[PDB]
Amino acid sequence: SWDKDVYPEPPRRTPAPSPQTSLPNPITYLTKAFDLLVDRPVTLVREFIERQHAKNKYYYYHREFRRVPDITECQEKDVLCMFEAEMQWRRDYKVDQEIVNIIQERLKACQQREGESHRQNCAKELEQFTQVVKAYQDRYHDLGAHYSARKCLAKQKQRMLAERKAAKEA
């Protein structure tokens, strides 16, 4: 249904029923009633719907975008090149927003899954979130509402200049 590598889940460890009471478990009978009254009728309706879908199989595709020269290769004021570089940058910006959203979803899922041990047991997810938020902030933060590839490039060059200066004097 979804890629487990993209949305990982640790293997699930359920304990076996180990009762130490003679009373019947009300949940067990309710569980059986639910599977009989709710699950079985629901599954039959779905299986009928899946039969109709199997008769009419058709396909859709994930659009693929070829890479084009980015803003750094565009001559000043050459709108024809700047336009394609700008459109590509805007698409990449939307993709990076969703990459951060995937990492945040991993982090939130880990916190709920690990319960009271989440602080120790979600260190890897918190690290990856921390690193990706830093990279995303470096690319896109402070550009303003009228952002562009040109402004993003100006931001990067300022950062590279500072990093060069610090490295040289060090």
């Binding site: 041990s117 602080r119 120790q120 260190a123």
Partner: protein
């Protein structure tokens, strides 16, 4: 409504004052305009600064909810003095005394909370002790480093 029955400029002469009182359906002896600063009151009457809550609730008012009669001059701040807003009714305790007790009570409590903060109550016990170097890993400590050991002895 004709222009002669609408509010006008501040009345300068006694004839104007008598005319303004008539327009507002008041006795010339009861009619008093707002002071003629440049604030824009004109000749509109200055009526007692009282809430409509203060009016007699048993009188057969034309507008019972407002306690207003048709044609009587409305207070400039009538909309502030409706029964849902500012009440000026007399109070069983003097206003000035009421402020002293409310402020005094609040000030005393705030003082005593500072005192109780400086001299907290507590029990005669030592600190709670936790194993594994005060739960260094569980509290999120870096696995790759090493905390200085926290050791707890029996007593």
């Amino acid at each position: 409504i004709t222009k002669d029955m609408l509010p006008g400029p501040y009345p300068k002469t006694p004839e104007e004052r008598a005319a303004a009182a008539k327009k507002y359906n008041m006795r010339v002896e009861d009619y008093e305009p707002y002071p003629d600063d440049g604030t824009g009151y004109g000749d509109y009457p200055k009526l007692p600064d009282r809430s409509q809550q203060e009016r007699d609730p048993w009188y057969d008012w034309d507008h019972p909810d407002l306690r207003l009669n048709w044609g009587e001059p409305m207070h400039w701040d009538l909309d502030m003095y409706i029964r849902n807003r500012v009440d000026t009714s007399p109070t069983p305790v003097n206003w000035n005394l009421m402020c002293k007790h409310l402020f005094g009570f609040v000030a005393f409590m705030l003082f005593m909370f500072w005192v109780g903060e400086t001299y907290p109550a507590y029990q005669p016990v030592g600190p709670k002790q936790y194993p594994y170097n005060n739960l260094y890993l569980e509290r999120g400590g870096d696995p790759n480093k090493e905390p200085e050991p926290v050791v707890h002895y029996e007593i």
